[PDB]
Design a binder for this molecule. Sequence first.
Ligand SMILES: *[C@@H]1O[C@H](CO)[C@@H](O[C@@H]2O[C@H](CO)[C@@H](O)[C@H](O)[C@H]2NC(C)=O)[C@H](O)[C@H]1NC(C)=O
Ligand SMILES: Cn1cnc2nc(N)[nH]c(=O)c21
Length: 246
Amino acid sequence: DVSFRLSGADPSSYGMFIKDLRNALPHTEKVYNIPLLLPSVSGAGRYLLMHLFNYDGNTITVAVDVTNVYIMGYLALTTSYFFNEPAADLASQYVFRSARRKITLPYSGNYERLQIAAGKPREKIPIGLPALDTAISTLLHYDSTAAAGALLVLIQTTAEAARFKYIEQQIQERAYRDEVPSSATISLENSWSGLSKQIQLAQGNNGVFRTPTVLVDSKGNRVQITNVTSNVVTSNIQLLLNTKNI
Ligand SMILES: *[C@@H]1O[C@H](CO)[C@@H](O[C@@H]2O[C@H](CO)[C@@H](O)[C@H](O)[C@H]2NC(C)=O)[C@H](O)[C@H]1NC(C)=O
Ligand SMILES: Cn1cnc2nc(N)[nH]c(=O)c21
């Protein structure tokens, strides 16, 4: 299991937690030097448990699917909360079984559905470590509308940071001050799948992408990624969703 305590957290400890998270994910092979995530895994070994502690010491345990890094649900004291979707439901059979009651949230865990329930797109929700602290706080006591917002912050300050060096860096800059995400961040978040597929399709194609991937950069200018020599591939992305899942 991996743990992170917001109390006494600085950019450095966060970096270590995200490194720990990355190393918690299994993989047998690397593609162009980046860990390729497993196609599938059997039983309880498919889920990673994250223990998160807010500033006051309260905690929630989050269950993450190790083949994609998707959050499936979490535990607050004695109530387990799971997304309203098949995979999440499958996940309820191996984790948080000793919970007194299990609640199914009224939405599945994809950005589109979470942004609807939250009432705002993630362009306008501030993220950072202070926000993570709030997120944890908000999940300790049920409120489907509040949880949507908190989960959008949680998914990004953990899963998305794990997948992209850039996003981990964005969060370290927001260690004592929240700030809405840059469009580069949103763009990356949205391309993890495409990039993952294209970096794999370049393996028997001299490192050249079958189809170019379009992102928005630091400045907000539209850019095209056609090949693995790009910074995004050489230095940004840290995990690859196996094509068997796309
Ligand atoms: C692969 O991507 C690189 C960019 O990392 C392309 O780079 C060209 O050369 C410089 C720096 O590498 C770029 O800024 C230029 O805009 C590019 N000029 C060209 C040749 O178009 C490189 O071209 C790409 N190579 C491919 C497509 O195999
Ligand atoms: C990032 N992401 C996209 N779809 C997702 N679905 C779930 N359930 N959890 C996630 O973290 C997620």
